[PDB]
Design a protein around this ligand. Structure first.
Ligand SMILES: CC(=O)N[C@@H]1[C@@H](O)[C@H](O[C@@H]2O[C@H](CO)[C@@H](O[C@@H]3O[C@H](CO)[C@@H](O[C@@H]4O[C@H](CO)[C@@H](O)[C@H](O)[C@H]4NC(C)=O)[C@H](O)[C@H]3NC(C)=O)[C@H](O)[C@H]2NC(C)=O)[C@@H](CO)O[C@H]1O
Ligand code: CA
Length: 273
């Protein structure tokens, strides 16, 4: 088979030494890499920029003519990644090399057979500040029809977090938008937790971390991302080969999803970044 799907809740990706490189989510589709040796026990695969090996035990072969395989498609304005059969995200502007409504396939979302994608927000250094002011960030809620968000009118807190921790506020808004449904998930509302941060406050089971109010949620999560990711050499969103996506999320397209929200916000606010 050319394509395999991840069966367990997560599965590891290994190098040729058997060292763990990363982990990917249930349902993720990986490509067989025909330039490297596979055997009965491990397949040479590629996913989201990462070339490595996976245990056959963790995979199911697909038939691309009846099973969903992720693909990319242009509507003539933007290029969309179908990350699931019923869900697409805009990743880039249309290029004249793209045929409208043709499905295109890629192991990294940058290299295609007839064109090359720039995904600049996917690789942007997150320690550089956004050119958007607090008042401009606050406008995004009306421009994208985001109702009932706990992050409404918190642009000033995102820009404070950026000033103090040296982390891009557009990234902070986009990450909280993707991770918490714009501060509307149950964990956002219960716990002012907009970035998916977990903690054992000694409390036996792993749970979402509690923050005392919306502002302390934004500032506290920024501190946690600075200390756990930025300060440890994860300084861009990236994919399964490099950046925050290697460790932050099993979803191979978490970084692409956040970059897509940054692209949409930047377009709505006049393209200053
Ligand atoms: C098509 C589209 O745009 N879909 C959107 C959804 O993606 C989105 O729902 C959110 O989806 C993300 C994944 O993209 C999901 O992220 C989970 O976040 C947790 C952290 O809270 C990660 O936990 C990691 O677990 C591993 C162990 O497996 C740990 O080692 C690691 O330390 C953990 N990370 C941290 C920081 O603690 C999960 O791996 C990760 N899950 C996946 C599958 O990647 C969010 O939880 C989703 N949020 C929801 C559902 O509210 C949705 C909502 O905005 O919008 C869709 O549009
Ligand atoms: Ca190694």
């Amino acid at each position: 088979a050319a394509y395999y799907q991840v069966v367990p809740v997560t599965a590891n990706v290994y190098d040729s030494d058997g060292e763990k490189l990363s982990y990917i989510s249930q349902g993720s589709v990986v490509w067989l890499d025909k330039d490297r040796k596979s055997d009965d026990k491990r397949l040479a695969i590629t996913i989201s920029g990462l070339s490595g090996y996976m245990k056959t035990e963790d995979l199911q072969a697909l038939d691309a003519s009846k099973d969903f395989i992720p693909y990319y498609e242009s509507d003539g304005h933007r290029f969309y990644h179908y990350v699931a059969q019923n869900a697409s995200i805009p990743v880039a502007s249309h290029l004249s090399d793209m045929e409208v409504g043709k499905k295109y396939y890629s192991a990294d979302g940058l290299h295609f057979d007839g064109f090359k994608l720039e995904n600049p927000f996917l690789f942007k250094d997150l320690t550089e500040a956004t050119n958007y002011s607090a008042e401009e960030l606050d406008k995004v809620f009306s421009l994208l029809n985001i109702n009932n968000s706990l992050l409404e009118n918190k642009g000033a807190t995102f820009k404070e977090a950026e000033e103090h921790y040296h982390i891009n506020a557009l990234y902070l808004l986009a990450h909280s938008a993707l991770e918490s449904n714009w501060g509307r998930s149950k964990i956002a509302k219960d716990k002012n937790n907009f970035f998916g941060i977990t903690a054992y406050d000694t409390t036996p089971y792993l749970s979402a971390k509690t923050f005392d109010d919306v502002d302390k949620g934004i500032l506290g999560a920024t501190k946690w991302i600075k200390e756990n990711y930025i300060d440890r050499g994860r300084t861009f969103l990236g994919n399964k080969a490099s950046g925050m996506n290697v460790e932050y999320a099993s979803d191979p397209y978490w970084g692409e999803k956040i970059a897509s929200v940054m692209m949409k916000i930047n377009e709505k606010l006049g393209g200053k970044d």
